[model samples]
Target: SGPVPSRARVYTDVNTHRPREYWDYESHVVEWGNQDDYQLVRKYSEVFEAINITNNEKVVVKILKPVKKKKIKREIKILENLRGGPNIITLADIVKDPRTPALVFEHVNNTDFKQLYQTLTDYDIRFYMYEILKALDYCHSMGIMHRDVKPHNVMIDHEHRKLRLIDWGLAEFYHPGQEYNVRVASRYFKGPELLVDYQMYDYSLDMWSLGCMLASMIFRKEPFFHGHDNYDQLVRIAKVLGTEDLYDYIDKYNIELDPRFNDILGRHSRKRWERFVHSENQHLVSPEALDFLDKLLRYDHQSRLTAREAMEHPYFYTVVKD
Candidate 1:
């Protein structure tokens, strides 16, 4: 909505392939009937959580706000394609009422990620991360990329040690040589290619996001890169990864950064990964962890590790044995 060029519009050639289907809420075979039948659990926008009367189970009902039909169909299609992947959230049904549509999903008995993350052991971090990569690998293998990957989208049921990657709204199918929307991910997790307007990115963008997640876990920072705005997002990344390499990256892809960055952007030497290690999070730090993270979070999307390759990394060797 702002000056984000990518957010300004999607390609004109893109068109939705479906229309209103049989999934309307009026036809929902819900056991207990109307609004009073279900108990409210949570609400975000039109998206709400409630107890399903049919099975006395909790389910998240994402009520689609006034968004495009194409966006909704794209998510449903992607979910349908990746339905059985481990750690991928299950999409139960779709229902639409007069005001907005809704997508139902199996509920995860999850605690707040902010609180849950703090309680994790080093092994817990590795275990959950490996689980996430299983999800990433599966989706990428299906030729899909989750443009938005962050702690918020990762649901963790620590009691059962379960993880599910949710929120497929920003996810899209990959076609080589195709340009994608750079406005897809949240600011902190935005890859260098995205910020610099390199449209020919792929699943490795998610790896950069995976790197951001790991960096936050090991460093105990909520967001490894804390940028105030879109422009500052690149500046923040430049501070850690260095502007020298950033220039090389942009030059390699012929990327032109948002002109506003010319003022605040300055040279910064790459900070050694070890510099982030300290007493607070020393427990989660490991040589393999750093090594694995380094392979992700690269300025060039191609240089970042693939989810499958990352799964085979030494960082997950112990987790794999278990």
Candidate 2:
């Protein structure tokens, strides 16, 4: 669970109508999910409620799975204590129903990165990613790690042109002198540490996924580091850069690479990923973006860049940032 914010709380007014100027967003929601919402909306494996909500405003209701009650409550508790980080989602309240458990969050109108990618220009891609990193950095500082960082887990606050993180289902808090390891994140976003969580690892895992994300966006395709399965994914990883010789890193991480899946073994892996090195696409990224990526993708998590360090990078210098 994420840490509860201390000395920071959400200020809410009950049953109020929210601004309705964003007709575009309302229409967009309706288009994706029938009726814009349900008296009680239940889809995507979770149920929600859209009450009259205030001055004619719409709110989203997210019900957590029963088994996740404690974790979800911990998430809300931490969210409650958090304050003043643009990168994090603003949790409105942990409204309780006598029956089921639910968390009420501010409704976001825009789409996810996967949808926005098509609509956004390359520069748009860069901006969205910048915001995401900012949030990641903030979370890390607050002693929180968003174990799940992926396109679908983030939402666009179209009205404000903001990016809000979603799904704290896998999130957890950090404590000084606390050494922790939790296997989380999609296959596409997994860092080397997660694959090999048996050893010491840290925030740099996120940089690896973020780097892969930048690469995928520029090419407008797969994150490039993706493998067909756990094994294939490993092979896909081996086929580039140094002779990653997963045999070493793999064994060190205690990763039991499955044998059935197809993969690009250590022998042929390096040559394949080398195709994208410092080519024209490299220039497509701003110095800040590249500088951060350079740090994020490094082999050593301890040596990787921290969140704040990334914010100060010069790559953000360009008005048309990568």
Candidate 3:
């Protein structure tokens, strides 16, 4: 009656919290001109920073251009469900104009992840990674899979040690018997299940993406898995995780590789995680870190470590003990 899935329950539960009424476009005090190009800060979404004149508070106003009504509602519903969930972005209001709809969100003092990531010490990486797991555990426990887990979607306020997981547009509820689309995450962050077209994936997919991000941080590679195309993506993954292991996954799942893969797929031995260590990143390369990462980057989605399982791992032992 509310919304079919459990993930939608929190959105429709009026008793959960008082509804933040939608504001009119006129009520916003624009910092820049009203023109789309002038107000744009993010390229993907025509997002602008503004102040709610009535409240005198800063907020991000994202204008969704020509998106379907269903998608708009889906994002809003997800934000509502995860409002106070660990590290999730807060959606303040949903405003509209004739051309497109605008969603208002609480302003975050975020620095670019690419620039920020390079400067992070090994301790910083471990600390923030633990924080990231907290957010992942919260969402997954609530029956939601943040299908798109990547560096870009993670907003970090390094100074305050704050983190917010944004962009729920690609996130979806994980129903036990449901089949999901494989075309969810970005190119390099895609899980082996996605590249192999496994339709019944769950939260394990996000773990794989997290593994990729961790690999990059520990190896100083922007994207640990660099694939030219989707076909190439699997090949890139196979190159690291090994072709034999991939075959094992395929056999276990009874997966049929797309015809396009026949030419490129080749036998490869699983590369040692230690091989990635160098003078620059050697400090982060601990046995515990390697072991934790190895478990997450497995070719078998089911075999990948769950967020809860990962948090309990020894990699976090020293940090957690402190």
Candidate 4:
């Protein structure tokens, strides 16, 4: 309980005494933020300018132009109910306009895992990922599920030099007996539950996305994913992890995947995963990062990692480094 995880001695663009660079996008709420229909732009807000793409020094002004009344209400409710969590960006202010609702959030800066591949140690990546899991853990315990979790949504806090879980746009509250009206999920990170279209879904879906996100971080790309098309995406997944053999869930639910599912599995699926491991060689990332990458991308929602459970892993137990 006394010692802490060792972190590399690092310097951020802000810490270099680079002129007046306080957290860049922290003030993004006030910058061109409309109560409704937020615009995505290079400049997020006055305080946080999109001066850089590191996700640092920038805040997102999401325009909640809700066509469905429920989405509008849910967006406001989710934004209002938000609180501090490690993986989450701090919601600084909420602006309600005659047309729509606008939110100001802390701007995160730094190149995300995409560019941070070789720049950080194994622990550095784990620390960043652990933070996101911690945030997702908070949201899950609270019954909130972030529907869309992707690289664009996850930001790197360059100031603190850690990875942060961001984006609450599709956040939904899941109750034990709740029924899912619509199935909304990101293609790459979508869980098996959402793939075939399950009736009742929960926060576990977020775990699937988190897993893929972890894979992308470690592999310096997605494990079994590509965005060419829906079929292609699933084919990529089958090629990497291999589809469930016994169809445990499929049998239980009397579910059947697309007819082309097995056809999509690469004859070299196993061989492909074997070769994909090589991509990690160039990233210069640490080993702990690999442990996390494995657990986060589990296709089965039931197999996803929980934040509390993840916090105690050996990765976080890494010896403090200079």
User: Which residue ranges in model 3 land beyond 4 Å of their true spot?
Assistant: 1-44
How many backbone overlaps does candidate 3 show?
A: 0
Clashing pairs in 1: 25-96
| Per-residue lDDT over 1-322 for candidate 3, one digit per residue giving the tens place of the 0 to 100 score | 1212112212122323333322111232322223232233443447778777666777788877786566666667667778998888998877765356777889998664666889888788888889889999888776678888988889999889899888888877665546788888999999888888878777788999999999998888898899998889999988888899898888777887788888898788888887889899887788888888898899877778888889899888877987
Error of 4 at 203 (Å): 2.1
lDDT of 4: 0.56
Between prediction 2 and prediction 3, the one with superior lDDT is 3
Query: In angstroms, how far off is 61's CA in candidate 4?
Result: 3.7
lDDT of each residue in 35-130, candidate 1, tens digit only: 443556877246677887867988887766777767877777777778989889998777655335677888876553556887788998999999
TM-score of each: 0.86, 0.72, 0.86, 0.70
Q: Native-vs-model 3 lDDT?
A: 0.77
Give the Å error, residue 102, model 3. Answer: 1.4
Put down candidate 4 lDDT per residue, 1-322, tens digits, no spaces: 1211111111112122422212222222332333333334654223222212333444555444545655655655555455565566677555555555555666666455555544556556666666676777776655567888766666675567666666565776664444564357767776766665554666667767767766665556644477566667755666666665325555555665667756655453323333555654445334555565566565555565666667666667753232
Question: In each prediction, how many residue pairs overlap at the backbone (N, C-alpha, C within less than 3 A)?
Answer: 1, 16, 0, 22
Candidate 2 TM-score, C-alpha based? 0.72
